Design an enzyme around this catalytic site. Structure first.
Site, PDB file in Angstrom:
ATOM      1  N   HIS A 116       0.813  -1.210   0.000  1.00 26.86           N
ATOM      2  CA  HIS A 116       0.000   0.000   0.000  1.00 26.86           C
ATOM      3  C   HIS A 116       0.851   1.267   0.000  1.00 26.86           C
ATOM      4  CE1 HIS A 116       0.391  -0.031   4.532  1.00 26.86           C
ATOM      5  NE2 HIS A 116       0.387   1.275   4.334  1.00 26.86           N
ATOM      6  N   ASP A 166       0.353  -7.696   1.731  1.00 22.95           N
ATOM      7  CA  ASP A 166       0.747  -6.286   1.693  1.00 22.95           C
ATOM      8  C   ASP A 166       2.275  -6.201   1.622  1.00 22.95           C
ATOM      9  OD1 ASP A 166       0.794  -3.594   1.749  1.00 22.95           O
ATOM     10  OD2 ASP A 166      -0.081  -3.404   3.784  1.00 22.95           O
ATOM     11  N   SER A 259       4.001   2.710   7.990  1.00 21.21           N
ATOM     12  CA  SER A 259       3.772   1.728   6.934  1.00 21.21           C
ATOM     13  C   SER A 259       5.043   1.290   6.225  1.00 21.21           C
ATOM     14  CB  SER A 259       2.823   2.333   5.907  1.00 21.21           C
ATOM     15  OG  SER A 259       1.540   2.477   6.473  1.00 21.21           O
TER      16      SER A 259
END
Ligand SMILES: *[C@@H]1O[C@H](CO[C@@H]2O[C@@H](C)[C@@H](O)[C@@H](O)[C@@H]2O)[C@@H](O[C@@H]2O[C@H](CO)[C@@H](O[C@@H]3O[C@H](CO)[C@@H](O)[C@H](O)[C@@H]3O)[C@H](O)[C@H]2NC(C)=O)[C@H](O)[C@H]1NC(C)=O
Ligand SMILES: N=C(N)c1ccc(N2CCN(c3ccccc3)CC2)nc1
Length: 310
Positions: A116, A166, A259
């Site tokens: 992402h 992910d 992230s």
């Protein structure tokens, strides 16, 4: 009779020989502690009668020096609930400014991050070697982004509820120079030694939101335990075995902007090395638990992607 001044190798050195003539010897050494010698049995060459420096394993070919993974020069001492860290504690940490996020250097040509982080950006801008964030220490130019094919592409990526798979690789245009502030993290092995257990500790690092600031200008880090996936579920969202749950202790947690950073775990077989067991992926409210892409489940994909894009 003259083999000549020896040729240099990248990230290695050869001491000036007292003689370059027949029967003399030279020795290549890699720039330690940041590089080691691949195969190349010893780095020692003698000057042969035909004028070549010759090594018994490599013949006239020169040795190759390759990055050492996983060993920070300065150990981390004592992101929600974290404390200040130096980039020397997490020299594999990569900063993305678009979007604000992290990644993990895994060798001189490849950065590992969450899918992402790069799903919207074919040419992500990346930075290494600085405790402080920056935009436009070293900026890394991407060559190509490889998003895992199990990552679900969305027309409206905000409001995703399925973060399965992910993970992404970014190939770099130029080899990253390793040093005290830049060095790769190791990858997990595929053996059962790398099956995380509840309560196992690792480190997270990043410039994401803290308990007092919407982002961090200087790196933060925290120590967090693995927890049963159940704990994360309890706090439409998809939970899979490709996700590690970690956190729950002292309100320490990853957060928005962390992230793609590595959940760094001490290697079970070499306690002095760290490996990327997880990547910051998603979670409920910050300060509780977080989900981390289970990197062990992707080692085959990581290795295949790198080999086929050398
Ligand atoms: C000078 O001579 C060396 C060979 O060295 C000689 O034998 C040693 C055992 C010592 O006694 C030395 O004192 C003596 O001079 C030549 O090395 C050879 O080079 C070629 C390529 O140039 C190598 O062939 C390649 O090897 C790779 C890896 O195996 C293969 O994949 C390739 O397809 C290719 O065949 C060869 O293996 C190598 N020999 C050895 C023993 O390593 C050197 O080329 C020569 N130089 C000059 C300028 O004449
Ligand atoms: N409690 C945690 N440890 C935690 C909380 C949030 C989080 N996030 C990163 C991913 N975010 C995102 C990114 C793109 C699209 C939609 C959501 C949501 C916020 N990570 C970890």
């Amino acid at each position: 009779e003259d083999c000549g001044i020896p040729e240099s190798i990248e990230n290695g050195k050869v001491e000036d020989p007292e003689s370059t003539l027949f029967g003399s010897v030279i020795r290549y050494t890699c720039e330690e502690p940041y590089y080691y010698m691949e195969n190349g049995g010893g780095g020692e060459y003698h000057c042969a009668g035909n004028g070549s420096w010759v090594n018994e394993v490599l013949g006239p070919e020169l040795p190759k020096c390759v990055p050492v993974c996983g060993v920070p020069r300065e150990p981390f001492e004592e992101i929600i609930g974290g404390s200040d860290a130096d980039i020397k504690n997490f020299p594999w940490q990569v900063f993305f400014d678009n979007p604000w996020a992290g990644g993990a250097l895994i060798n001189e040509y490849w950065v590992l991050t969450a899918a992402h982080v790069v799903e919207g950006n074919r040419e992500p801008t990346m930075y290494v070697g600085s405790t402080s964030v920056q935009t436009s220490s070293k900026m890394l130019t991407p060559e190509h982004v490889f998003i895992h094919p199990g990552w679900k592409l969305l027309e409206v990526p905000e409001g995703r509820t399925n973060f399965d798979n992910d993970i992404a690789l970014v190939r770099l245009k130029d080899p990253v120079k390793m040093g005290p502030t830049v060095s790769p993290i190791c990858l997990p092995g595929t053996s059962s030694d790398y099956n995380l257990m509840d309560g196992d500790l690792g480190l997270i690092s990043g410039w994401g939101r803290t308990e007092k600031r919407d982002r961090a200008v200087r790196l933060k880090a925290a120590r967090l335990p693995v927890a049963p996936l159940r704990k994360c579920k309890e706090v439409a969202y998809v939970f899979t075995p490709n996700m590690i749950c970690a956190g729950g202790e002292k309100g320490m947690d990853s957060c928005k902007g962390d992230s793609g950073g590595a959940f760094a775990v001490q290697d079970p077989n070499d306690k002095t090395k760290f490996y990327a067991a997880g990547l910051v992926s998603w979670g409920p409210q910050c300060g509780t638990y977080g989900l981390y892409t289970r990197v062990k489940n992707y080692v085959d994909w990581i290795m295949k992607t790198m080999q086929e894009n050398s």
